[PDB]
Design a binder for this molecule. Structure first.
Ligand SMILES: NC(=O)c1ccc[n+]([C@@H]2O[C@H](COP(=O)([O-])OP(=O)(O)OC[C@H]3O[C@@H](n4cnc5c(N)ncnc54)[C@H](O)[C@@H]3O)[C@@H](O)[C@H]2O)c1
Ligand SMILES: NC(=O)c1ccc[n+]([C@@H]2O[C@H](COP(=O)([O-])OP(=O)(O)OC[C@H]3O[C@@H](n4cnc5c(N)ncnc54)[C@H](O)[C@@H]3O)[C@@H](O)[C@H]2O)c1
Ligand SMILES: O=c1ccn([C@@H]2O[C@H](COP(=O)(O)OP(=O)(O)O[C@H]3O[C@H](CO)[C@@H](O)[C@H](O)[C@H]3O)[C@@H](O)[C@H]2O)c(=O)[nH]1
Ligand SMILES: O=c1ccn([C@@H]2O[C@H](COP(=O)(O)OP(=O)(O)O[C@H]3O[C@H](CO)[C@H](O)[C@H](O)[C@H]3O)[C@@H](O)[C@H]2O)c(=O)[nH]1
Lengths: 311, 310
């Protein structure tokens, strides 16, 4: 297939580019380096099956770009990803995550694209549901601008599906970790902990440290993107996670053991916008896509911590 | 109360301003005249309780405006309102209806505003629903960018409620009609029919004329806004309509009968983005708010026709 990946210079995006190329596809990458890194794509410099376009999804001529490259599937990973930043500047977050998605959809419906695979946020969109693990049937109840924008993006794509028959599916990951996650980023606890503990710098945990997330390895998430890119799951969201809960304190201990030093984090006040509990029911992904996560947290952290020691 | 009305120079907005003033409130009206008209507010030139601010919700310093006027309730009616326009330019529609709403909420949460009363689209947000009349419990399923942006606005305000305790309710009207509706465009069928038939100018229906809408009179809609402005229905949507379906053809006949003379509309191709049926269950608004529509279509059509005559 001809594929285009927005957010291609990022953590998940660059990993997806690699997989798509390995699968024999031609891949156009698109990014504006808001949070992405040149080093994530530097290995592809001489791969003729890959072309890179520097573009801001908010302002670029996406019509022209998509007309030029004629992708069959657009994998949409470009976003403002920081929940705290979304609270600090909700307009900016909405511009990238809602307006950017709308512009992409409008471009795609005119340029013969078959399908857009959106990236939602399984970890945040449900707020505090009564069910854990949380199924896709649970109503959305976003508690941060970031989460709201992700839901809004799903809804807009569903709208374009009705209007033009432009197919869409929403990959809604839990908390994704692994090689290439920015260690210096404001988000990405697994990367943050590793970077700090390996440097021997202070680590922090928020609240009492009982807040919980569902940790899924990047390779598993990438596989879900591939599976959903076919003619399937139209207008549907798929939770992509493990369905297992790990508290902030538990995670710190799991990374501290992997480093092999002290397990003594500081305790800081709760962060406005952050949920207390997150865990995804992944049954739908199994039934419909035949997708299951292969990597358990212990194995995953092991692959991750050893990536960071080489850097 | 100190009220602020976005979209105050518009059809529903100007009507709401009048009601709030009649109820003894102070009102700040805000508009950029995208589709509104100064003539809708010109009768207030010497009204000592309304002040007008010309501002674009997408680009203006809303923080500064709210800081100066310190409204307790913001009635948010400023929006791109045309469904076909939203299809032609979804980015622009999303900028006004989503980004504009987000900017307003971000300003409001910093400036001591108690509550934002949002205007959603009861008529369109459910798309093709499971049942008619449609209750608020039906899932949203927008099939035009306009409808999608209205849903997104609701969700964003709900988020600000969680974050900051900035209260919100979503007034979700069906098809609103009455005096001051602009008759010169492609939206606002009652006004379009009324002015054209009075002038002896051509009229049209789309497709086979069987599309239905739920036609609710502007004065009734305004009443719902006032009721929901209190500490009631936080985070909730209220369908505001009649729960009765009228076809395009039937409506044309009603307006033609009121005007007198021919009932012979042209037939044009169907419009992409337009739903085939719309009808709202209004039970929630009755129980919670004590709201009921008073004006039946026949009466409403007469009042509308008379506005356009004079
Ligand atoms: N990492 C997680 O735990 C997680 C979980 C669920 C959802 N997601 C979603 O996955 C996607 C990828 O996130 P990630 O973890 O790889 O983060 P990342 O920051 O590494 O990747 C995001 C990429 O988007 C690019 N981008 C941002 N704004 C852009 C714009 N206006 N125009 C063009 N490119 C732009 C950035 O430069 C970056 O390369 C995002 O949509 C994110 O919301 C991430
Ligand atoms: N008329 C209906 O059938 C109906 C029913 C459901 C929802 N609504 C909603 O009711 C509200 C009022 O619509 P209406 O029927 O009075 O139409 P209208 O066009 O008369 O009113 C909308 C007003 O918003 C103003 N506006 C638009 N963009 C703006 C911007 N960027 N900054 C500031 N002001 C801006 C316009 O100038 C206008 O005065 C809208 O939110 C609309 O979506 C209308
Ligand atoms: O010249 C015309 C114009 C319209 N119609 C018909 O009238 C109906 C209503 O159309 P229109 O007046 O354009 O309104 P809608 O597109 O239904 O949307 C209106 O009502 C919505 C709520 O249902 C609001 O959200 C929108 O802001 C408002 O524009 C449709 O069935 C049209 O086919 C005609 O027959 N002839
Ligand atoms: O130094 C830190 C940083 C984080 N955490 C905890 O680790 C968990 C995860 O926090 P992250 O900032 O890593 O991620 P979020 O849960 O905030 O996830 C959000 O940010 C991600 C970006 O990596 C994705 O965009 C995702 O969709 C979005 O919900 C939280 O419970 C947080 O309290 C710590 O204990 N210490």
């Amino acid at each position: 297939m001809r594929a285009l990946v927005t957010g291609a210079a990022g953590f998940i995006g660059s990993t997806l580019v690699d997989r798509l190329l390995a699968d024999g596809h031609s891949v156009v990458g698109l990014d504006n380096f808001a949070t992405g890194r040149a080093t994530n794509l530097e290995h592809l410099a001489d791969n003729s099956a890959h072309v890179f376009v520097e573009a801001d999804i908010v302002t670029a001529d996406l019509h022209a770009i998509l007309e030029q490259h004629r992708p069959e599937v657009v994998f949409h990973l470009a976003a403002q990803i920081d929940v705290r930043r979304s609270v600090a500047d909700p307009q900016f977050d909405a511009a990238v995550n809602v307006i950017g998605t709308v512009r992409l959809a409008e471009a795609a419906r005119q340029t013969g694209v078959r399908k857009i695979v959106h990236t939602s946020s399984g970890g945040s969109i449900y707020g505090t549901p009564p069910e854990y693990p949380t199924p896709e049937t649970a109503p959305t109840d976003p508690a941060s601008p970031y989460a709201a924008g992700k839901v809004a993006g799903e809804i807009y794509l569903n709208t374009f599906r009705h209007l033009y028959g432009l197919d869409c599916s929403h990959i809604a990951p839990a908390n994704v970790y692994g090689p290439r996650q920015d260690p210096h980023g404001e988000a990405g606890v697994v990367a943050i902990f590793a970077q700090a503990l390996l440097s021997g710098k202070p680590t922090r945990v928020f609240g009492d440290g009982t807040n919980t997330r569902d940790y899924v390895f990047v390779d598993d998430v990438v596989d879900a993107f591939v599976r959903v890119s076919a003619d399937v799951g139209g207008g549907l969201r798929f939770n992509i996670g493990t369905g297992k809960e790990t508290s902030d304190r538990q995670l710190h201990s799991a990374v501290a053991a992997a480093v092999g030093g002290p397990d003594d984090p500081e305790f800081h006040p709760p962060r406005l916008g952050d949920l207390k509990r997150s865990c995804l029911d992944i049954g739908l992904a199994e039934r419909v896509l035949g997708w299951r996560p292969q990597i358990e947290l212990a194995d995953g952290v092991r692959r991750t911590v050893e990536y960071f020691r080489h850097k």
